[PDB]
Every structure is written in structure tokens, then in C-alpha cells.
């Protein structure tokens, strides 16, 4: 369904230092988080409390798993309902030079309904990071509540905290594309979007790849830091604060000469959840800018969409 | 990678026993419960769906497969829902067909499963779906009914519950004129149980289906466009501890005619525990399978392929 | 895709295929009858050794026994070499292998470099050799059966030097996925040859049929022992019209191994192509060259010798 | 292969601004094509009397067949004896972004035999042309055998004009890749090779596209110049030269924005000529530096290989 698309080679005047970093654990990071939100829809956060150990053992398992034979790791795909998938991203012909896990969570663990890891050690080191990952983003989302005012403590947190929670968690590897190493453009390794649940948490390894759009369109390359958490508001959450957290947009470009290895949780709420603006961020007589819409329906929705796509345009109100 | 061809089935493959169930006579619930557990498969007749239904639905979806293959495909692909060609599910099985999957809601279409666009097909689908999932509950009761528990709504219930997990499908089988006249048929779609509760399927005339008899002969199911055909499916073989013997079947590409298939499924909620009906464990009785939720048995089913023994591997040992 | 065909019944064999014995009075006339009615005849008493052919084939047998990939690398088949399921250059298939060689007279030409493996270029050229002996003596039978008194009026077109002569091998494997089924696969689609002829062994296994005058389609039972001969377009012309050549195909054995021999006789590039003065034309005037470069942009099943028709 | 490889865009730093010149209607050509011909393999020809008017109609003519639909063309397909093609260049593989004609010529001419193209305009106009630059084939091979001391002053054209000589001419069109535009990376238009004959005399439009390498490996990009012809030492003039010439590797890099026409003559000798270094050229004891071999062995072992391969090393001692 059509190739890789490829993209210009980034610059080194790409580069962008100014991701707003928070350290959660300390005084003024509700604030520094919303205004992270609020300009970039993306931050870095440190001294988030998860051991470098258990990162490097996820990722050493990872490597190890991804190292296998192309009709080895074909057994455990493909990616739908979970599982392995090599290059196709979705049901709609997107590609990326990429191969990944696509896995389920109940709660703070792996699904034992998804039975992609087999391997009990790859397995067991992903579900030390994975209640790792998950407290951090728990700890995000009430520092969001909190530097929004709202007294309510768990006011986003609870929304994967309840049970039947919607939560994905993705492992992805670009390896280097040789072929092209030198020649002014370079393969997407995973093509423009922004992600619909309400954040995803990213953790990567060393090598470099993933990009921001800029709210004036530009696209600027992130620092790669192993031992940083990264964090992307949602289209869901964007809902949930009426507009002022915009979905950031990022892509991945793959690096020619290293692997990039990537572990990203996704929070999404129950199915059933009805999303709209928290009635608490609502002035009096503010209007919602979406259509009334449930968790299922919108997944849906973009289960049916392109990668690149403005899936909230559609919810929105006209 | 191919799509497996077949022994072209001949007349000494029809069968004349498939059990017939009238829907409207009292003594429907013991037919029912006796087919089921003997076939795990039967015909209904007098089911109160007007034939003006389900021909204005199958017309509708004739129009719709007439049209060319790139205004198809966009409504492509399948899944989460929508329509498909030649694949069936995500491992790699194929058939001799073009489908569409939709999502219902209660009993209608829902509002969003969008495909199909076009108003006037999705009014007759929404007809006909009616009157399916009426035929339905009625066959589930019957079935309660002739398994003597008291509660009339036992099964019914979990097809009609809020959050109801209802499939519906539309399989377009077209003639394969290259292999006309010579000796073996495309597979239309490959040997599989169903893994819900309850399919009932309505055809056009065209030859096609076949059923697995116990002692594993394939034999032909003559078609017959005015009544239903009923499946216990895997979730049932489950709620009955064995008793109802999920039917595995196949369609048999006809080189020569289209089939046009309708099918409803009936699942119930995605958290649902599947597990024999306490009314059905005697004394001390032990249950043949290990418990599941049907959103595990659907996710594991998703993971299989097509003719795998799915139950297998949620029995006990 | 390759194309299906009506698995072939028990019904349809042909008993009645004419048999030329070589080394008996009347070959002359056999062979002269089987031409005109069938375009197709066996040859028996031909003087090729049983031991020739079997290592010519257990050779062919070895190298197609090696891997895809080492198989591959003699690949693909043309100017020659090995090829698989393609036929041609306009999107013919069949279920079949096999290796397309150049003759230079009666061996493989130093310049075919496939095979590599001496052992089985000395088995395929030792048969090459015997059959091509076999291919002049058949068509000197013709000549003395059409009233010729030069004996090698149509001998001497492919012992000319830059005779145009190909040899082909070919491997139908078995087809696990059809097995008794009544559908089979197609193993190499019907044509003509383009040739003057055609020299056929096989092992034992089935699959060779023939199109009638009708013209049915019907088997001819393998004999590992013998060679069937085809008229190709070439002699049609040769002959004005009097052989017309053979429509032929192979139907794939689904659970056997068939492994074919055939030798081409064809003239020299330069050899302008009529109707032999001796024999009087309905066909226009060109050359060998001319009929092999038009072949080769057709399908397999097209009627190439239309376009020179009047 | 299967994908058509991509290769860096080429800047202006990468503008080769020596190419040799070589006024064909002066005394100093002789000279000029020697030193060209030992040191680049390949030189620019000017005043070469080809009327611009035959180049333009050939072209547009060229660019009517090319903008025929693609059914339209693919009649005239396959490539092989004779014909069109697209993309796939010769057995083993290789891929270009290009379509082509690749046709054949008798005497002066296109052959009769080569039925492609069927438009008498089009042939009428390729034959002008052809006629023209066969000329000019000539004339630059007898500057060459002046220029090396030969006294007989055809002892290289004449392999050419000789009867049954294989002369091959081809047209190739490298339209836009709009996907590509400004992203740094071009594609291949036509892989690296040599050519296996003895000279091939090119035009194009001006539509940049045409590399070569140099004798130290750099890759550097020619100036198009849509009236002048370029000229390529094959790599069966470097065994008659017996290595002096050094046939040029080269390619073509397909241009984003602009479709890109070229006419390429291909000298080439009878088939069973044998072809190894002229005996003027061995100084007494000499030795070859090659196997002996001919033409049709060359051409065939040609298409044995891949495009990129070094045709010339199994026949060399
Ligand atoms: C075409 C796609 C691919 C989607 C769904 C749809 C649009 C959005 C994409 C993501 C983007 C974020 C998550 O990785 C994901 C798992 C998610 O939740 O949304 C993706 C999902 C997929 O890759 O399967
Ligand atoms: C058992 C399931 C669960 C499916 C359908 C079927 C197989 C594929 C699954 C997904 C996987 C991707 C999307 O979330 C989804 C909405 C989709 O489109 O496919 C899923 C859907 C569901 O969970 O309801
Ligand atoms: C390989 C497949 C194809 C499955 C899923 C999996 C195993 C069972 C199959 C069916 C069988 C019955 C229904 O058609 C179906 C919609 C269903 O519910 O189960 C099928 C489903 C699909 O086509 O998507
Ligand atoms: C479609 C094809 C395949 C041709 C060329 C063209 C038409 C005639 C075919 C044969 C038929 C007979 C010989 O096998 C053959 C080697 C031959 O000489 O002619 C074939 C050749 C080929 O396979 O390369
Ligand atoms: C080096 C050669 C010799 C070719 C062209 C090119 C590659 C393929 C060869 C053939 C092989 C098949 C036909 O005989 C032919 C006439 C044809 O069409 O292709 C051949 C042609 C030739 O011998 O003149
Ligand atoms: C891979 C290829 C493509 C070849 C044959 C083989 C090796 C050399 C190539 C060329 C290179 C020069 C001419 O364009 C050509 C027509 C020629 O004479 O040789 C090419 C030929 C072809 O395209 O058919
Ligand atoms: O893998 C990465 O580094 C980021 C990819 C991403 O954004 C996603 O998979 O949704
Ligand atoms: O389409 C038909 O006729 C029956 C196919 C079937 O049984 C199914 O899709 O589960
Ligand atoms: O004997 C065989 O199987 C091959 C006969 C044939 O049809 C051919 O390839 O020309
Ligand atoms: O087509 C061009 O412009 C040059 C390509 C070339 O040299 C060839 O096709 O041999």
C-alpha cells in the first residue's frame, strides 16, 4: 500500500533546546507542567523515580527480542489484536521503516490475554517498567489537575486508573536504514501524528529520531536522553481541557547508522467513557468545542483513519 | 499467500436431515434443543420476517458488490468494521469472496459503524436487522425453554444486555468462471465454528454451504432464500457444558451464481464470564472448560486461524 | 497466476499415437503419415543407449534437487540459462523449471556456460549428441518418404553450420496442493513449436498431451525408452502445408516428478523459409530470424504462423 | 532488486567543467578524441553537421509516443527482442525510473524486422536521425584510428558499417518524480554500467540527468547541451585498443522537476566478429591483454550479468 515516504534529512539547526522540563518530584512542577501543555502539547520529565536498571533490562530484553530472525519474530504477529508487526502502521496503508510490539495492559501489568512476550524473562522485565511507567504517568496527570485548580485530585489520573482502562503499551525499533546513509533525505520511521487517548509517556534509548511540530508548523528534532521520560498530551485530553492542552504532533525519522529502541504507555479511559471538557475548566456559560463522543467511538474512528489525519476535526463543533 | 480449492461437491453430497424448526409451533424449543444437540445446526421456518425484508436487503447489496473495486475500497477495510475482499481475519486465511462487517447497536445498525454510506442500503440492512435479531431472542428462548430453566431470557438476555458485542455480516461469493467445468471449486470461505453464542444466516437460492456431521463427512446444505439457518457457536457449546455442539462449516464457491449471504451473531457483553449455566450442572457435575470472559475468547479467536479448534485451548484438561 | 485445467481422465488416452521403427524397411512411409494426420509421432529402435539417458537425467535430476537460491544464480533462462514458471516474455507461466541451452552442432556450445558442473555437461552432451543424430536421421526418413532424391534436403538445415538448435530440460514437480482434486495445474501451456522439429524424452511420469485434427485434446502415455517428434511451423512451411505442426501442452502430474528432454531443430539465422522447390506456396517470403524474434513477442498459445499466412 | 535505488541529489559542486570538446570538422579532432578517449572514456561533440531540425522532430516525435497511455504503450511491449519497456532494464533485476524504446537498426536505418514503432511519422523521423548520427559514429571513429597511427583509415569504423553489423539504438525518457522534490535524494534514472559495444553516441534535451565516473571513482554530472552529442568509449573498444581507451562508466540521475528525452546509437560489429586488440597496436611481442572471444559471446555473457557488473574482467588474462 505504497512505500516509506521519505523526508528531508534533519539539520542540526533542527535541533531544539527548549523542551520544558519538570521534575515531578518538586515545588512548581504542576505549573511548569501545564505550561508545557499549554505551548507545546510536550515535555521532558526527570527524577520521575524509575530505576535505570529496570529501563536498561526492558530494553536489553527488547534488543534481544528484535535481534531474532525475521520468521522468528513473524510467530508471534501479526500486531492486531496484539502482538508483532513489522513496517505497516494500522489498517490504512501507512509504513514506517520500523518493526514494533503492540501489547495490552490490565491495570499496571501486561494483559494475560495478550500472550505476546512468551518468553517469561522478556515478559517479566517489561512488567517491571511497564508499573513504572504507569505510576509516572499517574503522577503527570495530577500534576495536570493540580496546575489547572482542580481539587479534585484525581480528575485525569482516575480515568486509567478505573478498571477497564484502555491502555496500550507499544515497543518500537527502527533500525538503520544503511542504504541511505549520506544522500540528503532519510526514511520515516513512523509518520506524522498525534496520538488520541489522553498522554503517552515515551522513554527511548540513545539514539536520535523523534521530532515535534512547532505550533507555527516546523518541525524541530528532540534531544534523545535514556534516562528522561517524554510526554505528549493527547487528542482526548485535548478535549478534556476544551482546547488549551493542544495534541502535540511528532514523527520519527529513522537514523541511518543506529537502532532506536522506544517504549511508549498510552492512557486511555474505559471504553465506555464519555469525553468532553471537565465541567470544573468551564466558565460559566462556556461552550464545549466538540461533539459529545465515548472513548470506543473515537478509537474507532481512527482505527478507520489515515496516520496522518486531524482525527479531532471531525468531533469538532461547527 | 492462495486460496484453497476443493472437491467440486456433487449431488451425493446433500443432505435431506437438517432438522427444521417452526417457530411459530409449541414444539419448537424441543426441535431446537435436539438439533442443537445433535447438528448444533437447523433451519427455521414461519419466523415472522417478511420476504419484501429480506429481498430489499439483498438487492441493496447487490448494487453495493456491482459496484467497480476502487468505490468498494473505500470503504475498505474491514476492521474495525466496514468491507473487505478475499481476507478473512488478520492471519493470513482467504476466500473466493467480498464482505462487509458492521457493528450493530441493539438492533440496528450503529450509528458508528458509517459503513454503508448510501442511505437507502443502510435503511434496508436496518429493516432487515430487525427482524433477524427477533429471530434471535425467539430462538434463544426456545432453547431455554427446551432445557427446562425456568428464566425465559437465560440466553436471550445476553444478546440483548446494554454493550451486546452483535456482529453482521454480508458475503458477496461471485462466480469463479475460470474454474467452470473443471472439477473442483474455490473455497469461499474456509472450515471454521463460530465463536459466539448464535449465527443465523439467510442466503439467496445459490448452492454453497456445508456442514461437518459429527462423524466429520461434509455434506451440502440445500439452500432455501425464505427460512434462517441457526449455528450454536463455541460460547454456547460452553454455556450448555458440552451438551450443544458448536457446527464448523464452510462455503463452497459456486463457479456459475453469486451467493449472497446475511449473517447475525450473537455475543454478548465484552465482560461477560462464559461458563456452563449453574442450572445445567447436575450434582457435583464438573465443568469441561476453564473460565473465560468472552472479550478473551474473542481476542484469542482474532489470534487464531480461521479452522483452528479455538475451545481447545480453554478446556480443561 | 498459472492456469487450471480439467485433470485429464483415464478416458481420453491415446492408444493410436503411429510408431516409427527406425531401423525397419518403411520408416520412410511411417513417419510421412504420422506427419500429415498428427504432426506427432514415437520413434523406437533409435540406437541411443538406455545408460545415455538415464545419466543425462539423473544429472538434471541432482541440479534441480539443489536449492532455490543455487539454482538462481545459473538463472534466468535467457539468452539461456535456468528459469522457473515464466515462459517467455509476455507473462506465460507454468509449474515447471528448467534449463534453456545452446547447441553449436551436435554439443552444448562453450559459450551456454550453464551447467557448470563437468560431470553434467558431459551426460547432457553425450545424449545431446545422440539425439541430434537421432533428429537427422528422422528428417532424412522424411525426405525419402516425400519422393526427395536429395536425402538431406531438410537434414542439412540444422547440420548447416550456424544451425540455430536449442535444447531445453524440463521438471514438472509434483503439486501437493492439488492432489486428487480433478483440477490440475499446467505444467507448460499449448503451442506450436517454431522449428523444422522437435525430439522429446521423458521419464515415465504423465503429462504430455497433443491436440487433435478437431481438435481434442488428448494424453499421450510416456514411454522412458523412446522419443516423440513434433512437427514445428518451420516444416509446415517447408512443406506448404502438407505437415501441419502439433498443438501441444503438459499437464502437471500432481503427485509425480516429470523430467523432459527436448531437442529444436532449426535452421541457420540467415535461412529464408518456403516451401521446398521440390515439393509444388501459401506462406510469405522470411527468414528464420525473422519467425524467432516474431515468436518471441507472442504468447505461447498464439497462432504464430498467421502472420505470415497470405 | 525490486526498488529503484536512490543516490545523493547532485549539487553544483559536483559539475564536472573539463568534459572534453571535440570539434569534429577540424584537424586537431584526431588528437583531441585520443587523449579524451585514454584519459575520460568520454567526450563532447560539436559541429558534428546533424541539423538541429532532425534532433526537435525525433524529439517531439519521441514525446508523442511517450505520452500515450500506458496500455497504448505496453502494446508495443515488452523491451525484448524489440520494443517498449518501463522501469526494468535488461534480465538480471535492475531498475531504472525511465521508459524506453529499445530498437533495432539495419545499414543506416531502423530494420524492417523491428516492427517498433508502427507510426510511419515517428519512423521517419528515427531514421532521419539515425542516419545522422551513424555518420557521426563514423567520423569519430576514424579520428580515432588517425589519432592512434593506424594508416588504413576504417580500421575501426568499419566494424560498424560492415554488413550485419549489430547496431542498436535507444530511446529513453526519465519523466519528473514530483514525490521527490526538494527532499536532498534523487533517483536512478539508469544504474551505473559500462557499454559492452565499441562506441554509443548520445543526445538528450536539456533536462540534466547524465553522470559520469572519473578515473579516481568521483561521480561527476555533465552538462546537457541539447545540441551536441556526447560519446562513450565501450568496453569492446578497450580490448581492440588493448586498454588505451577505457571504456566510461556512467549513469543517469533522474531530474525531480523535468522530464529528461535521450537517443543513444550503440556501434556495435557483426556478431561472429572476433574482437581482440588490432594488430597495428601490438607493438612486435606485445601481448593482449584479453581472452579472445566475439561479439555474440561478449553480448550474450552481457546479458548473463547485472548492469553494474565489470563485463570485461572474465575476459581479461
Ligand atoms: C492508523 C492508526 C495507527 C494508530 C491508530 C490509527 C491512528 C492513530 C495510531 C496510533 C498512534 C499512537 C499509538 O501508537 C496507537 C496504538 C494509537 O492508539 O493511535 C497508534 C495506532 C496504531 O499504530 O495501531
Ligand atoms: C477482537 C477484536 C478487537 C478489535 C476487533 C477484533 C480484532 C481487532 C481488534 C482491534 C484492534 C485495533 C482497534 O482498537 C480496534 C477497534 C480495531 O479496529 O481492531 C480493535 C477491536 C476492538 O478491540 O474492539
Ligand atoms: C480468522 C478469524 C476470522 C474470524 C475471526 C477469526 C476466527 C473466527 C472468525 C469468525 C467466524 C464467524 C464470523 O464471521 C466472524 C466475524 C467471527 O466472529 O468469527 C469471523 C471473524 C472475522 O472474519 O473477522
Ligand atoms: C512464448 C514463447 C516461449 C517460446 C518463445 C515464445 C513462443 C514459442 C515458445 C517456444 C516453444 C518451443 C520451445 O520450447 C521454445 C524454446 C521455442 O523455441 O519456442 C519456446 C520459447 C521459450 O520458451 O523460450
Ligand atoms: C544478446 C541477445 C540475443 C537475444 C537478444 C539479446 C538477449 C536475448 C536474446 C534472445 C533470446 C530469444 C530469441 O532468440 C531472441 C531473438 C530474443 O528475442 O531474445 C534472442 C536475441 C538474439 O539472439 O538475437
Ligand atoms: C543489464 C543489462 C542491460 C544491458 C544488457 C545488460 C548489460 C548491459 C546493458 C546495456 C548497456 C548499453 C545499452 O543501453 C544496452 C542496450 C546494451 O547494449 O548493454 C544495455 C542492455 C539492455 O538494456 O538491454
Ligand atoms: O517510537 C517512538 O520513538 C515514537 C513513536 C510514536 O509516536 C507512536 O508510536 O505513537
Ligand atoms: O456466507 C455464508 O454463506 C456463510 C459464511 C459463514 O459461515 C461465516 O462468515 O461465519
Ligand atoms: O515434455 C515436456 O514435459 C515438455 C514439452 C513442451 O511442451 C515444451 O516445453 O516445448
Ligand atoms: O539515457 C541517457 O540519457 C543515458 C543512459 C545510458 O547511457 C544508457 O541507457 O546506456
Known amino acids: 500500500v505504497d512505500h516509506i515516504p521519505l523526508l528531508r534529512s534533519?539539520?542540526?539547526?533542527?535541533?531544539?533546546?527548549?523542551?520544558p522540563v519538570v521534575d515531578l518530584g518538586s515545588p512548581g512542577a504542576a505549573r511548569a507542567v501545564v505550561d508545557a501543555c499549554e505551548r507545546y502539547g510536550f515535555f521532558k520529565v526527570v527524577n520521575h523515580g524509575v530505576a535505570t536498571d529496570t529501563m536498561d533490562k526492558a530494553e536489553s530484553?527488547?534488543?534481544?527480542?528484535?535481534?531474532?530472525?525475521?520468521?522468528?519474530?513473524?510467530?508471534?504477529?501479526?500486531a492486531y489484536?496484539?502482538?508483532?508487526?513489522?513496517?505497516?502502521?494500522?489498517?490504512?496503508?501507512?509504513?514506517?521503516?520500523?518493526?514494533y510490539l503492540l501489547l495490552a495492559l490490565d491495570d499496571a501489568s501486561l494483559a494475560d490475554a495478550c500472550t505476546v512476550?512468551?518468553?517469561?524473562?522478556?515478559?517479566?522485565?517489561?512488567?517491571?517498567?511497564?508499573?513504572?511507567?504507569?505510576?509516572?504517568?499517574?503522577?503527570?496527570?495530577?500534576?495536570?489537575?493540580?496546575?489547572?485548580?482542580i481539587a479534585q485530585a484525581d480528575a485525569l489520573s482516575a480515568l486509567v486508573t478505573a478498571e477497564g482502562s484502555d491502555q496500550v503499551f507499544r515497543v518500537?525499533?527502527?533500525?538503520?536504514?544503511?542504504?541511505?546513509?549520506?544522500?540528503?533525505?532519510?526514511?520515516?520511521?513512523?509518520?506524522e501524528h498525534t496520538d488520541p487517548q489522553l498522554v503517552s509517556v515515551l522513554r527511548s534509548n540513545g539514539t536520535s529520531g523523534l521530532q515535534?511540530?512547532?505550533?507555527?508548523?516546523?518541525?524541530?528534532?528532540?534531544?534523545?536522553?535514556?534516562?528522561?521520560?517524554?510526554?505528549?498530551?493527547?487528542?482526548?485530553?485535548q478535549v478534556l481541557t476544551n482546547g488549551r492542552f493542544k495534541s502535540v504532533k511528532h514523527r520519527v525519522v529513522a537514523n541511518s547508522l543506529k537502532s532506536r529502541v522506544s517504549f511508549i504507555?498510552?492512557?486511555?479511559?474505559?471504553?465506555?467513557?464519555?469525553?468532553?471538557?471537565?465541567?470544573?475548566?468551564?466558565?460559566?456559560?462556556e461552550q464545549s468545542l466538540y461533539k459529545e463522543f465515548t472513548w470506543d467511538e473515537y478509537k474507532k474512528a481512527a482505527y478507520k483513519s489515515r496516520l496522518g489525519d486531524n482525527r479531532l476535526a471531525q468531533f469538532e463543533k461547527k
Open 10 to 19: 534533519p539539520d542540526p539547526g533542527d535541533v531544539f533546546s527548549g523542551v
Open 172 to 191: 518500537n525499533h527502527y533500525p538503520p536504514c544503511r542504504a541511505l546513509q549520506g544522500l540528503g533525505c532519510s526514511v520515516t520511521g513512523f509518520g
Open 117 to 149: 512476550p512468551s518468553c517469561a524473562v522478556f515478559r517479566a522485565a517489561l512488567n517491571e517498567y511497564i508499573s513504572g511507567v504507569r505510576k509516572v504517568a499517574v503522577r503527570v496527570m495530577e500534576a495536570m489537575s493540580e496546575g489547572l485548580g
Open 212 to 237: 515535534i511540530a512547532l505550533r507555527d508548523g516546523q518541525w524541530v528534532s528532540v534531544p534523545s536522553d535514556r534516562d528522561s521520560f517524554f510526554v505528549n498530551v493527547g487528542d482526548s485530553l
Open 265 to 285: 504507555y498510552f492512557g486511555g479511559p474505559p471504553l465506555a467513557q464519555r469525553i468532553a471538557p471537565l465541567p470544573q475548566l468551564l466558565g460559566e456559560g
Open 61 to 78: 530484553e527488547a534488543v534481544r527480542f528484535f535481534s531474532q530472525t525475521q520468521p522468528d519474530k513473524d510467530r508471534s504477529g501479526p
Open 81 to 99: 489484536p496484539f502482538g508483532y508487526g513489522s513496517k505497516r502502521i494500522g489498517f490504512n496503508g501507512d509504513m514506517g521503516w520500523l518493526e
